[PDB]
């Protein structure tokens, strides 16, 4: 079977483009990217059409990873299309669960990415107003989480 996952954050410019790029590298490294549909999206308005924050592009490249993602908002359609919607923080989870209630045929399991961390750092905090170390944090969380997530659902 093909599986599908959409990573979500507030803006789709800092966190979820990282989570998406990390998961895609993972599946590609494992030679199973033909069995996954992967994307990322935003709860909010704030950045649609933008490329990821320079700090996220520079963090990903420190780790050998690029992304061609442009920010987009999560749609009602995303609740039907994706098997998993994995989000960064509790405001994102609140907002997704609320939105999901307007979708008659919601099929997605909506969870926090951090719920899969073996080190139990539940929350992947917005790094925008932080510094480059906070981006690196986010990256390390997404590595840990994504690997556990794939080990569970592969």
3-class DSSP string for 85-145:
EEECCHHHHHHHHHHHCCCCCCCCEEEEHHHHCCCCCCCCCCCCCCCHHHHHHHHHHHHHH
Domain chopping of the chain, boundaries: 1-154
Query: Is there a contact between 88 and 114 (Cβ–Cβ < 8 Å)?
Result: yes
Resolution stated for this PDB structure, in Å: 1.6
Measured between alpha carbons, how far is 23 from 145 in angstroms, rounded to an integer? 9
Experimental approach: X-ray
Which fold would CATH assign to domain 1-154? Rossmann fold (3.40.50)
Determine whether 9 is an active site residue: yes
Query: Is there a contact between 86 and 78 (Cβ–Cβ < 8 Å)?
Result: no
* Catalytic site residue from 9, 87, 145, 146: 9
* Catalytic site residue from 15, 24, 55, 144: 15
């Amino acid at each position: 079977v093909t599986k599908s996952v959409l990573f979500v954050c507030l803006g789709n410019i800092c966190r979820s483009p990282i989570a998406e790029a990390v998961f895609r590298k993972l599946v590609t490294d494992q030679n199973i990217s033909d069995n996954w549909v992967i994307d990322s999206g935003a709860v909010s308005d704030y950045e649609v059409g933008r490329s990821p924050d320079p700090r996220a592009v520079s963090c990903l490249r420190n780790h050998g990873i690029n992304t061609a993602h442009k920010a987009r908002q999560v749609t009602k359609e995303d609740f039907v299309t994706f098997d998993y919607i994995l989000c960064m923080d509790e405001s994102n989870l609140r907002d997704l669960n609320r939105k999901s209630n307007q979708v008659k045929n919601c099929r997605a399991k909506i969870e926090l990415l951090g719920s899969y961390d073996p080190q139990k750092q539940l929350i992947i905090e917005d790094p925008y107003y932080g510094n480059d170390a906070d981006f690196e944090t986010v990256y390390q969380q997404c590595v840990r989480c994504c690997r556990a997530f794939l080990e569970k659902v592969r």
